[PDB]
Amino acid sequence: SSNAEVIKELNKCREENSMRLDLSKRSIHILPSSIKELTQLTELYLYSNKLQSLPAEVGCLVNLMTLALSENSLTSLPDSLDNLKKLRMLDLRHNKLREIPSVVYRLDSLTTLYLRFNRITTVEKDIKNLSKLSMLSIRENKIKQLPAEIGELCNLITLDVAHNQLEHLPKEIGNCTQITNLDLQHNELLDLPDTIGNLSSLSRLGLRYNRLSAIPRSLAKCSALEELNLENNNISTLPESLLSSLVKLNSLTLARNCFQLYPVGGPSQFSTIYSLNMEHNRINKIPFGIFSRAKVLSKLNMKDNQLTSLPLDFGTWTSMVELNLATNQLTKIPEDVSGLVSLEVLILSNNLLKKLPHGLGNLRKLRELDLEENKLESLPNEIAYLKDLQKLVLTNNQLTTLPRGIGHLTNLTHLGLGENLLTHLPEEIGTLENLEELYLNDNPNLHSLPFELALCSKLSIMSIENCPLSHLPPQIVAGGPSFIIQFLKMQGPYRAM
């Protein structure tokens, strides 16, 4: 972009006396000093350019309120910006700064300051001069510690310091009582200050990917929290009565932390939570009656744990919609499962299940049932009642035959039967009118396919690898699933139709 275009637009802005000037996305390398004349400017946009400095004449724009400089190559700012006593927003993201430019600390009128994607390493104590600051985003820098003077930003509402190197938070942060969004994820925090509980207005607290070994109990004062995501830390236990005090908390994630037992605090500590994710831990037992007050608990994720049995109150979980028990040590499913009348998704992959209970047939709302990597010897006949079942994954088991009720899963689109010991498919496979995918790969004893498989008019993916299929002609089997479906139509009773 030629500079002469920029000069012409600058003249156009002068004549129009536009309170707004937008020079963004013009690959400007250097800016003309004539900018001095545009004293009427209240908004100046310069984002997505190649600027490496600003001219000191920018400080002449004493009426300027918004200055957007993001997505540049700046390393400093001219000291003349101190004249902008009306500047409310300063945007300096993706800009290759190594320190907050000193002139920024003197802009006592700022309410919004963006410094993302820069190589800033510390916030100096002069941050207190920005007493009117309500938005501070110093995300994605190399900051190792925050100054205690951060606590004088009493008007701060959102503090976004994610993807930094904070080891501890300054205890003074509690004096910022108007904070509602505190993003601290992808840091190296080792503990949280007890004064965090003074942020009584806090609704969003981002803590995942840090190194916290515990949570302060004073956090229980932050009753405005709606989501507590504590993923990827060392938390092994929660403070007693922490959960039961967060009466707005609807999403709890305690994943990838070192929990061996469920959090202490009794059934009342889950009474307001829609979703509980406790994956990748070492919990070996779900306590009896733990969800007795969890009237709105819909999603329970227990993947990658050490559950050896389900609690005997399992059937009481009427409200449950999605239950994930994958990568555990379960040897059986209690008949009580029939109480889960609202259950829609049941993930049981990577367990030690040999049989499924009769009660599996009462899961009238079950749509997805994943049973991959178990030791299943057979399917119960009641499988025929899962009329809303759409996905039935049975890969890597010891299944040998399918019950004739399998054809009653009229809503089934996915039937995964890979890595099993199947000898035949039942002829009722042909009533799966909506069957779209049928995986039969690695069935060493599947020597034939029923003619009725030709009635599955939507079947669009089928795996036959490492199946003998010896009752089918060698040329047809080598021709792939297209030729086998064609062969079963024309040699079967359904050709003339």
Numbering used by the authors: 85 to 581
Publication passage describing the model:
RAS proteins are GTP-dependent intracellular molecular switches that are anchored to the plasma membrane, which activate the RAF kinases through direct binding and membrane recruitment, resulting in RAF dimerization and pathway activation. Prior to pathway activation, RAF is trapped in a catalytically inactive conformation by 14-3-3 through its interaction with a specific NTpS (pS365 in BRAF) that is required for 14-3-3-dependent negative regulation, and a phosphoserine (pS) C-terminal to RAF kinase domain5 (CTpS). Genetic knockout of Shoc2 suppresses the growth of a subset of KRAS-mutant cancer cell lines and inhibits tumour growth in mouse models of KRAS-driven lung cancer, demonstrating that SHOC2 function is critical for RAS–RAF pathway activation. Here we present a cryo-electron microscopy structure of the SHOC2–PP1C–MRAS complex to an overall resolution of 3 Å, revealing a tripartite molecular architecture in which a crescent-shaped SHOC2 acts as a cradle and brings together PP1C and MRAS.
To further characterize SHOC2, we determined its x-ray crystal structure to a resolution of 3.2 Å. Whereas the overall structure of SHOC2 alone is similar to SHOC2 in complex with PP1C–RAS, PP1C–RAS binding induces a conformational change in the SHOC2 crescent. SHOC2 undergoes a twist that is spread evenly throughout the LRRs, resulting in a tilting of the C-terminal end compared with the N-terminal end by 9°.
